[PDB]
Amino acid sequence: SFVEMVDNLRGKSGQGYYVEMTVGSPPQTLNILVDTGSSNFAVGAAPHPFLHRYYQRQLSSTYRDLRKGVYVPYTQGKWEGELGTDLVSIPHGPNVTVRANIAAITESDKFFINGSNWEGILGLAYAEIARPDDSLEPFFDSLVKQTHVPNLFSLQLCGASVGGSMIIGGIDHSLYTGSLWYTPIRREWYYEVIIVRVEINGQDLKMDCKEYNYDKSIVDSGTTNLRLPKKVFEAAVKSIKAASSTEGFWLGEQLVCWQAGTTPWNIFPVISLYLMGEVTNQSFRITILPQQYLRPVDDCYKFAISQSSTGTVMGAVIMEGFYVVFDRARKRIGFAVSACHVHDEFRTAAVEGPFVTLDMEDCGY
Ligand SMILES: CC(C)C[C@H](NC(=O)[C@@H](NC(=O)[C@@H](N)CNC(=O)c1nnn[nH]1)C(C)C)C(=O)NC[C@](O)(CCc1ccccc1)C(=O)Nc1cccc(C(=O)O)c1
């Protein structure tokens, strides 16, 4: 039941959230990064200087080889390895065992992070973006096909040492407040959504909404940042600079620092994303505070908004403080402020609707 799954995720800031899983017979225990921006279940299966532990296929009696290699590239990092299948379970998830596809990772470049403490990646999106091709059924599909776990999951990620919940199979009503607001998954590959308006401190950014979605906007819990397309990224920074003109960093390369507890939170604006809703001409908005897009790294911070080579990418930083529901069953993603919400002296992060927005169809690429 859901109480066993609450707080089943861990992290280091800016390095991802993982969940304990076990693979094989007998079970090998591994920490697996939870990723909504990809679709391959893969694990280190070979010594690496950043891996404390890895998958030993030859120790497992249920491992079957598929005699077939694979390569997977990501925003940061890439790996290749051998596809097989094996028995998989989630200790603090639903009480089941599935046979799932598994990529034994043999070579990697910039993929494993030093001191990250995860040793694998669970892609939670759809077959279509699965390597080598869409016939390699992704973990979540196998789980839904082979057991009675309903076709949906929720992510509640929290910031500082980093924790949260993956409610697999449902929604835990105690982990958020107010109502859940939904947005169509435009297409079942990435968790693709449409952003229809963007406001900075209450001011519309005045751009054509095709710009926000230049290519595709996605919810990617495997990336840290809020990534905006060039044109939008440039407008955002110009607004954020102006709102904070009162005080290199803007490119995310270097930290800024303040004497413990005097972070001038008030001089940094709130950003509002309006997402397409479930009814005609209707949207809703999520409001993000400086405390989300200035990443805790004296209290020090990295700027967590960077330039994108796709559309708008809602990374780990935007999801922090929200309860997000991946309602695959009904082709929608749900947003609410969670229990572990962001704390500011004079403002709240919020999920507010309904809003009316004409011509939302125009914003799609
Ligand atoms: C580097 C990354 C953005 C590549 C991209 N990878 C992914 O999307 C992976 N997911 C992720 O990386 C996630 N962080 C979420 N997605 C994004 O951030 C994002 N998607 N698009 N832009 N950004 C998985 C879904 C595998 C991909 O597979 N893209 C598809 C493709 O464009 C196809 C290219 C191709 C050309 C001709 C025939 C067939 C395919 C791609 O490989 N692109 C691509 C671009 C640059 C480098 C590399 C590389 O291998 O190093 C690959």
Side-chain angles (χ1 to χ4, degrees):
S1 68
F2 304 159
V3 63
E4 298 104 300
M5 308 187 208
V6 171
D7 282 306
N8 59 353
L9 313 182
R10 292 143 98 212
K12 281 205 196 279
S13 165
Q15 286 173 14
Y17 301 72
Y18 55 90
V19 66
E20 181 166 34
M21 286 177 102
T22 68
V23 307
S25 298
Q28 307 170 43
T29 296
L30 290 169
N31 279 168
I32 312 292
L33 183 86
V34 161
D35 184 26
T36 63
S38 74
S39 294
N40 284 76
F41 184 31
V43 291
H48 184 281
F50 307 142
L51 294 185
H52 304 129
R53 40 182 202 190
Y54 61 95
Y55 179 43
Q56 292 163 335
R57 300 174 262 181
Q58 78 280 351
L59 292 205
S60 165
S61 83
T62 41
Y63 174 85
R64 309 184 183 155
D65 197 329
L66 285 164
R67 297 184 117 277
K68 165 81 86 72
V70 66
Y71 164 85
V72 190
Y74 302 81
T75 312
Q76 67 278 333
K78 42 181 65 198
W79 53 264
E80 44 188 47
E82 269 81 62
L83 292 165
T85 72
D86 210 343
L87 287 204
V88 167
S89 77
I90 305 139
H92 313 273
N95 178 37
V96 295
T97 313
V98 287
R99 176 159 284 275
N101 297 310
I102 309 199
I105 298 182
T106 66
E107 262 198 31
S108 60
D109 168 51
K110 308 142 124 50
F111 180 69
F112 300 118
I113 295 153
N114 179 358
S116 83
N117 197 40
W118 51 267
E119 306 103 12
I121 188 161
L122 165 57
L124 296 151
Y126 296 96
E128 170 133 79
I129 61 163
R131 300 310 183 99
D133 69 284
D134 65 30
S135 59
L136 192 74
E137 95 162 349
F139 180 89
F140 201 80
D141 296 45
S142 310
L143 163 68
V144 166
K145 224 197 89 233
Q146 290 162 42
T147 84
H148 283 132
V149 175
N151 187 24
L152 91 144
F153 67 91
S154 303
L155 283 173
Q156 173 221 33
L157 316 164
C158 310
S161 84
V162 112
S165 321
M166 184 174 166
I167 313 304
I168 281 150
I171 300 172
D172 195 318
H173 301 242
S174 53
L175 298 165
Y176 64 93
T177 52
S179 275
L180 279 160
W181 295 85
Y182 291 97
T183 196
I185 290 164
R186 188 186 182 201
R187 176 173 159 202
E188 299 175 4
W189 60 330
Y190 293 92
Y191 287 105
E192 204 198 321
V193 297
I194 295 157
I195 310 214
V196 305
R197 189 180 307 160
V198 176
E199 279 188 352
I200 298 206
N201 262 359
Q203 291 244 310
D204 190 327
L205 226 48
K206 313 264 90 284
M207 315 181 59
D208 187 322
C209 61
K210 274 198 207 294
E211 299 289 9
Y212 306 128
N213 304 294
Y214 175 71
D215 203 29
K216 73 218 167 228
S217 302
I218 71 177
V219 186
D220 171 34
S221 82
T223 252
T224 299
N225 279 21
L226 168 65
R227 296 134 63 192
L228 300 153
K230 180 176 144 37
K231 227 303 232 305
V232 182
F233 174 79
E234 282 158 31
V237 172
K238 179 158 164 211
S239 292
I240 301 189
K241 271 173 190 155
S244 61
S245 61
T246 196
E247 292 217 2
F249 163 91
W250 298 111
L251 291 192
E253 289 152 14
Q254 43 182 324
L255 39 150
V256 283
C257 293
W258 286 285
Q259 223 215 347
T262 67
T263 325
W265 290 125
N266 88 307
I267 69 151
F268 283 102
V270 299
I271 303 168
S272 280
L273 301 186
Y274 295 68
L275 285 162
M276 178 182 280
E278 296 183 279
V279 302
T280 294
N281 297 168
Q282 173 263 324
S283 61
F284 71 86
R285 97 201 161 184
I286 81 207
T287 306
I288 129 209
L289 302 176
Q291 286 89 347
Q292 286 172 78
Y293 69 81
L294 300 173
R295 201 179 81 254
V297 155
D298 277 28
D299 295 321
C300 305
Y301 301 97
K302 275 187 193 213
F303 190 49
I305 301 161
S306 49
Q307 202 185 101
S308 158
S309 45
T310 357
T312 304
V313 178
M314 300 167 56
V317 113
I318 303 309
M319 289 170 91
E320 180 221 47
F322 298 98
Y323 189 78
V324 187
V325 181
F326 297 86
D327 197 350
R328 301 156 56 89
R330 283 170 81 170
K331 296 150 188 188
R332 49 178 199 167
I333 297 189
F335 292 87
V337 5
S338 58
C340 81
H341 71 125
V342 171
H343 259 120
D344 179 290
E345 91 96 25
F346 82 102
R347 298 170 291 187
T348 346
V351 186
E352 303 158 324
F355 283 81
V356 64
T357 301
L358 312 174
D359 300 312
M360 289 188 297
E361 229 46 84
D362 302 348
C363 311
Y365 191 78

